[PDB]
From a paper:
At present, the best structurally characterized pLGIC is the G. violaceus ligand-gated ion channel (GLIC), of prokaryotic origin. Each subunit consists of an extracellular domain (ECD), predominantly in a β-sandwich fold, and a transmembrane domain (TMD) composed of four helices, labeled M1–M4. However, the GLIC is a pH-gated channel, activated by lowering the pH, with a maximal activation at pH 4 and a pH50 around 5. We instead found that proton activation is a complex multiple loci mechanism, with the key contribution stemming from the coupling interface between the extracellular and transmembrane domain, with E35 acting as a key proton-sensing residue.
Numbering used by the authors:
A (entry chain A), B (entry chain B), C (entry chain C), D (entry chain E), E (entry chain D): 5 to 315
Write the structure that this text describes.
Amino acid sequence: VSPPPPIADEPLTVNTGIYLIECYSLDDKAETFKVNAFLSLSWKDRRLAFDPVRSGVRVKTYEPEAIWIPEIRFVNVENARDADVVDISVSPDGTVQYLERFSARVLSPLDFRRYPFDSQTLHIYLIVRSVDTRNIVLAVDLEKVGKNDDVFLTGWDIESFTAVVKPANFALEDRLESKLDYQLRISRQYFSYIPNIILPMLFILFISWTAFWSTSYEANVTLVVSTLIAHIAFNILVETNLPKTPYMTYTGAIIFMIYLFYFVAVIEVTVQQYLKVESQPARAASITRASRIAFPVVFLLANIILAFLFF
Amino acid sequence: VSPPPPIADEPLTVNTGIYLIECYSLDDKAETFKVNAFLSLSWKDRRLAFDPVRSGVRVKTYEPEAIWIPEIRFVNVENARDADVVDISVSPDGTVQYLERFSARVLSPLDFRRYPFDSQTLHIYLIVRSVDTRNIVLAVDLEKVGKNDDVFLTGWDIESFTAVVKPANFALEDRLESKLDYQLRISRQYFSYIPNIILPMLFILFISWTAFWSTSYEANVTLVVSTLIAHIAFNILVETNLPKTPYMTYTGAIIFMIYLFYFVAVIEVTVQQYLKVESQPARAASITRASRIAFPVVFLLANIILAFLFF
Amino acid sequence: VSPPPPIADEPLTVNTGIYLIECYSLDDKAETFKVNAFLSLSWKDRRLAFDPVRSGVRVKTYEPEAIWIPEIRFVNVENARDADVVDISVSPDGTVQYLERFSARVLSPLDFRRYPFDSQTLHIYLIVRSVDTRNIVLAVDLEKVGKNDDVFLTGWDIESFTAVVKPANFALEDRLESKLDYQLRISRQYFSYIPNIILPMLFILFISWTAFWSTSYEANVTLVVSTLIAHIAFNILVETNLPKTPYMTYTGAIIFMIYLFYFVAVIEVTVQQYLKVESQPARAASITRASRIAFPVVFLLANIILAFLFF
Amino acid sequence: VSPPPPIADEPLTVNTGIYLIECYSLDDKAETFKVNAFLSLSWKDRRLAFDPVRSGVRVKTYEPEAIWIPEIRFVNVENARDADVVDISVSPDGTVQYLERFSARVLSPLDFRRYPFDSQTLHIYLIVRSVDTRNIVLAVDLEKVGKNDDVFLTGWDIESFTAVVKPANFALEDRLESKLDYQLRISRQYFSYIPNIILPMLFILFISWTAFWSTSYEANVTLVVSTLIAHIAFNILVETNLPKTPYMTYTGAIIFMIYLFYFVAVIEVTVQQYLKVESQPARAASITRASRIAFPVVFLLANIILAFLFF
Amino acid sequence: VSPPPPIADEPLTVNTGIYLIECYSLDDKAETFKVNAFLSLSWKDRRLAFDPVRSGVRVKTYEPEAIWIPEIRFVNVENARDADVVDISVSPDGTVQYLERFSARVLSPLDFRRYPFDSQTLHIYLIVRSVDTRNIVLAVDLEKVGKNDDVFLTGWDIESFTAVVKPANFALEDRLESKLDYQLRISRQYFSYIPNIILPMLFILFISWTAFWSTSYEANVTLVVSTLIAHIAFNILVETNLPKTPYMTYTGAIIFMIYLFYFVAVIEVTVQQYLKVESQPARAASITRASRIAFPVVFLLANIILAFLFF
Ligand SMILES: [Cl-]
Ligand SMILES: [Cl-]
Ligand SMILES: [Cl-]
Ligand SMILES: [Cl-]
Ligand SMILES: [Cl-]
Ligand SMILES: [Cl-]
Ligand SMILES: [Cl-]
Ligand code: NA
Ligand code: NA
Ligand code: NA
Ligand code: NA
Ligand code: NA
Ligand code: NA
């Protein structure tokens, strides 16, 4: 079976639609998500036209093997989609209506700059390669784009699922390709990060600052070094949920900055002890009293500066 | 092969049944479970009618390829089910009895609010899409719904496996869909959480309170900070077995609240030391004595309040 | 192809055999194991009978497609077995000898009560569903049941592989099922648990008891709290190799009991310090001296009681 | 279908091309990467020649089954590539133009000597085995070699994708093999290693050196041993992201060297304490003062020497 | 298609060869490795003989379906090999030359006694089952056994790939089986274990011995307990890379023995403190001075004894 022949010199328009049934497994490290959806295709094939009066039937059902079907592929998939044809219907004028249900692991880059307060635009790129007899061009049937109300992506809020209606037409190996961009806009449910990572991380930091109300070097060393090790455990925990980025994320910036605070608290604790041994406790008392104000104040201002640069 | 023709204007009724053979791998993080079951289907196709006198047999066996079979799909599966046809029996009136054995990874959301004392209703949604020639509607044969006595889901108790007998019939892409809800009610075996997470977590918390019977700042700092780090290890352990939820779980609430207790114990330990250095041990003694009662009392009342809000 | 016809009203006997080639991947958490074996089937088909004088041949080889073969399935498998037919031999009387090689992931529950000194009975349940024309019943050919001498299951000793010769015959969805139970008896190689978990766990416990020969609260607090944290690391290590059980395991019971010992050692260390501060060191000396005997004695007796309840 | 016949005694030239669509999952431990690309093949088959005047058509489309196609394989793949034929076009002279889209897990060794500041040359080796009737030789069509602009490999920068145009022609099992080398040059995005591993590791090292401004043995022991344990946690973290190499990596060398610094700081801390107890604090003061300069100076010079040997 | 008929009563000899293309994923825990190789087979089928004069052709190419091919299987594979036929060639006398490329996950036991200084002999067992018409026997064509020069097994050195030329002929389910043993001799690249596990483990052990030059119980307790916890972290790290063995490995023996050294150092530290409190520091000084020599001396001799028993 060959492609439908043109009346003039017009390309063949394959109208498309994607109806999401399931969204699952958004893997941040892999920058992938799994999708279960309906792919609907429609085009005119005059060779398939019939008279409903003469044939009796208003529509004709076909097996994929019996007719020409455009080879539609996904650009950003790991392996070719697992697809199962649901129906093929042909109106008297030869308008074919094809429907298949598929599943696919989609590869789509994520911007982690504002993590865990980030929003993403996931993409599903549909593509068709033209043949020598005909140039094939893709279109969007908006009445056939959508998602099931129950569609849930664990740890994310689905905002919208739309299609950029004008395809990106280009040459690849001296043949025309027509590409469509289906965009799934999502925003991360940041909630759990607050009681599990953010507040525990602040609590251990504030505990290290109790060393500014202590003259005991041994206890101070314990407070600052112990909490520093717990900070390292949180840094390791966070970086295991994320891929390695060539930029700084919001959480990464805070986590990094908090090390400087631990480092400066060790200097203070060291200086205090040194002065007391040198019989200068009055000078050490001045440094410790200033630290009580300076550490929370510089921490609050540094955080305002960071929140400003990132949001 | 086309669908069976109607006598009047009646939809074709495909009776269904699901008999569970195996339940395994309830993945809390993924919100999935694996199932191995029997899917039985039954419909009338009068085109398949036969006379046992003329044919010899009283029931005819068919290969799936030989006859029209309704395209029945699962809504909430990751990939299309692994299925193997066991039997296709046709009786003289044209009634077809179809039996297949399948295995599928089912995606079903879980409510972790009361974790690890939670119950869940797992769902298996069966669906059929109508054709232009006929509207296909699903029914439940209750005599064909059940589960093997040996069906065990590691770490869970299976309560019941029933079907909501009235299908959800609705429009989807200008065709009718008939959906059935099969519900597997389960409840978590909370037992192991007690000696492995809950009691160890309470023991280390009670150990931190021994600081209220000590005047040694160095020892108190070690007791409270060391046990706090062990609490962080339990928080990390717990959160690795759970997905990130946009709500607070019972365990999460307790784990979070216990940080406040560690934070306030550090303040007490700091205050006590400060007063002793300022030559006010009588005042410090009053605060430490009150803490001995206040900490267990507030811990018990806070826990009663939490158990009330969650149960 | 239809099933063989009966002479009288007798069921068709399908003689079975399982010869293990490989045993691997006993996953304790999943409660699964992987098997690579031979499945042999034997039944009589009179339609297939021939005279070896007239035909010349003593046996006839067949392709699966050419003859009727009973649909034999495994009950407790994750997915249907990956099978490859090795041979089909038909003798003059019509006795068919079928041989296939298969691989399957078998789901079989494990009793962890005596872990890591436990023995298990793994099961492979074979099943056949009867047809309308004939009732099919399973039998065991003992000469065709066995295992390769080289069959090794990493971390386990294989004791025996036998079959319960009488099938479980029962009705399921108004048809007869014939089920056979093939039992693989294994016992855990507990050896490695001794130098890697048990003895390290006892060493750190005995190290905490050195606090009974020390009057230094600061050092005592370090000894008891540090070793307690190492105990938590062993508890976490152990519980990651096991599924969550609605009962107590042997190791779990010991691990749990050892927490009580750490808790009571903290009370002793606290009491001793308190009395010394209250200028009562003679009383504290009496409690520490008793603890030196009481702690090992109660530890040994509690362990004897536990070993008795579990074995 | 047999291979095309030669005019003289010339080998059959199969022109090749690889156009990358997706690059993903560069697994450092496994030394593998996943690829989704176009494989284009072109050869002449005189048997397929036609007159475009007589046949009307300018090109002829074929199904793979209809014509002879060379068996082209990948050398360094885990399993055979998952391939789907896109097009087969035949010009009037008999020049066949074959295009397939494939996905493959490619096994390619990595040099970790300069990790995490390393560059790699990933290889995709194409091969063809000659037949008895004809010797098949591979060529590169440079116009059919390339990559999608959007091609991203998480944690890496793609520099170039080129082919070594001259094949490696060699005998293997008394038949000719023609092998082509497609090279994907990449360089690691080292950025994230700086705030997550390198700077945290230096901070804890500098914290241990504060012991050189302290006369408190107890505090010193805590500072040096605690930071040493945090170093061990970083060493373990790093070595889990890398395979075991029969050579030293850059990071490995630094991580190893830093242990010697911790070991010598423990000797210093021990010596100081010993002298103070022996009533020689003047001598200890001289050693501690020298260590304040010696430790950072030797650390800086040792690092210059290492950076020189590795870069 | 039936097997070739014998001239006399001679068995059918299938000559075999395995040429390794890729070796990868030697999983120590699973005791498996993945292989990508060529399997070549050769046998005589007189029914396939032709006159080169009459037919013109010197060799005849066949599709697997067209002729009888021996069912050759691998004994120690997880699942049946993924195989693709490269060529089937038939000389005029009827000698068939079959070549296929395959990939397989091979299950082969490993001896960890000398880990990480161990050598292994990996096995690939080829097998053929006899038929009633003929006894099929396997042979090795040594000119067709080998490996690609580029064959690399990450973390291992490949020494040789040879075949035990005489098959192990035996009865299995009343048919003769012909088995061949292909042996891949490898030796572990122990290098990385030295800077990553062995030297770090010795450094922390030597640090605990600095307690023998200290009279500070509090500091001693910190030194010995902190380093002991780091030893536990190394024990856990090592045992995660290895399966549980019913014997002691070299590393396991050293790791275990080092616990006894930590235990005895705690006794010494305890004894020293006890004597000082009892006003016997002269006696404690004698024990501490002896320990300075005794601990390194007993450590060196115990290690010589262990190296002797294991090598
Ligand atoms: Cl696709
Ligand atoms: Cl263009
Ligand atoms: Cl074009
Ligand atoms: Cl489905
Ligand atoms: Cl099965
Ligand atoms: Cl390939
Ligand atoms: Cl095989
Ligand atoms: Na088609
Ligand atoms: Na059908
Ligand atoms: Na059959
Ligand atoms: Na301490
Ligand atoms: Na072909
Ligand atoms: Na064959």
